[PDB]
Copies of this chain bind each other. A is one copy, B any other.
Amino acid sequence: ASMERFLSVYDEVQAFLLDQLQSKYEIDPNRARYLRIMMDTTCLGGKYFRGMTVVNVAEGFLAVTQHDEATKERILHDACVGGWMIEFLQAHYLVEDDIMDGSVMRRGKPCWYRFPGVTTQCAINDGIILKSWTQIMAWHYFADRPFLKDLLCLFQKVDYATAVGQMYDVTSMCDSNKLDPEVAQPMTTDFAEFTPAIYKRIVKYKTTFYTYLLPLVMGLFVSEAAASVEMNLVERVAHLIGEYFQVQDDVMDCFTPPEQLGKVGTDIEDAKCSWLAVTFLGKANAAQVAEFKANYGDKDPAKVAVVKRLYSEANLQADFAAYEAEVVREVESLIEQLKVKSPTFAESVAVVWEKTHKRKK
């Protein structure tokens, strides 16, 4: 009902983008083609959680708010375009993240850079184009909209936030006091920065702003219902669900086979400050902690297997359920406080929470 409306607007956006390249950017048909496959491979294939949040939030408000048929048509269209803005922004992140994480598979297919006729050299620019598309979309479809200014200001701050998060994420396996562009960076030995506080910082910026804050508040913008809600609660609900979503993603990088995921894990091999590792060091004994340090951050399969072993043995799925329960408490609690000013946005969050809580992919 909304999903089919969503995916129809992509074709409309893609055509307006690719035609503009012909009529303004002197593009030859083969490059226009290349960019079509690029767009397809990088924007489609995923869960569309971020996009469909914008649309579900908008639909929410359209059931209680009196509008003419045309305005209802307009709000539903803006919401899909905004959804695609966020989806193109994630396309951009994944392309760039994959190169940064040396990944092999993504959404069941090879990573964009790993495509034989792409390579790292082109993918980098492809990523930049994906970003650039978000803005052309915005200015084109939203030029004459009351919400343009807010939308763009939020957007570019969500984006900055994400990139700051990546910085924390790719340097999470270095000792802070050793960071220096002049000197090649040695991987941590004491793992003293694998603390819940430092991990929560990584996840906040690299995930929660663009995966939760942005779509929720976006769907409010297209509805012009930003005043109708309590931001401090929206900020808090988004950061809490997002941290969970990332904790989820972390557990799956270890335990969920790529056949279902469908990407191949790299968190152990890459020395990532993952949820699994932090929790482990938060409970392990001296000897367990010792074996970890001699086997983590290495691409050697048996050393990765030694780490996967230690995680099963250290019974981490138990610390997961104590965290999951603690989250549902806090999530349900935060939804209650929202039922006051904005009942329609509370159930919107509830739906996004259910989607998130029961995801496996």
* Residues of A10-29 whose CB lies within 8 A of B: 21, 25-28
Residues of B near A153 (CB, < 8 A) are: 139
Q: Is the CB of A181 within 8 A of B118?
A: yes
A-B pairs, 7 with minimum CB distance: A135-B156, A132-B160, A116-B184, A30-B176, A117-B181, A117-B183, A115-B181
* A164, chain B: closest CB distance, angstroms: 5
Chain A 162-200: CB-based contact to B (< 8 A → 1; otherwise 0): 011011101100001101111111000000000000000
Contacts of A28 in B (CB 8 A): 176
Q: Which of B27, B118, B152, B163 contacts A129 (CB 8 A)?
A: B163
Q: Could you show 29 A-B contacts with beta carbons less than 8 Å apart?
A: A25-B161, A25-B205, A27-B164, A28-B176, A30-B176, A30-B177, A31-B171, A31-B176, A33-B179, A34-B180, A34-B181, A35-B167, A99-B120, A99-B124, A100-B121, A115-B181, A116-B182, A116-B183, A117-B181, A117-B184, A117-B185, A122-B171, A124-B124, A125-B167, A128-B163, A129-B164, A133-B160, A139-B153, A139-B156
Q: Which residue of B lies closest to A200 (CB)?
A: B26
Binding site for B on A (CB under 8 A): 21, 25-28, 30-31, 33-35, 37-38, 41, 96, 99-100, 115-118, 120-122, 124-125, 128-129, 131-133, 135-136, 139, 152-153, 156-157, 159-161, 163-164, 166-168, 170-171, 176-177, 179-185, 201, 204-205
A59 to B125, CA, bound (A): 36
What residue in chain B is nearest A27 (Cβ atoms)? B164
Across-interface contacts of A181 in B (CB, < 8 A): 34, 37-38, 41, 115-118
Give CA–CA (A128, B177) in the complex, Å. 24
Check A164/B117 contact, CB under 8 A, given A99-B124, A156-B132: no
A308 to chain B, nearest CB (A): 24
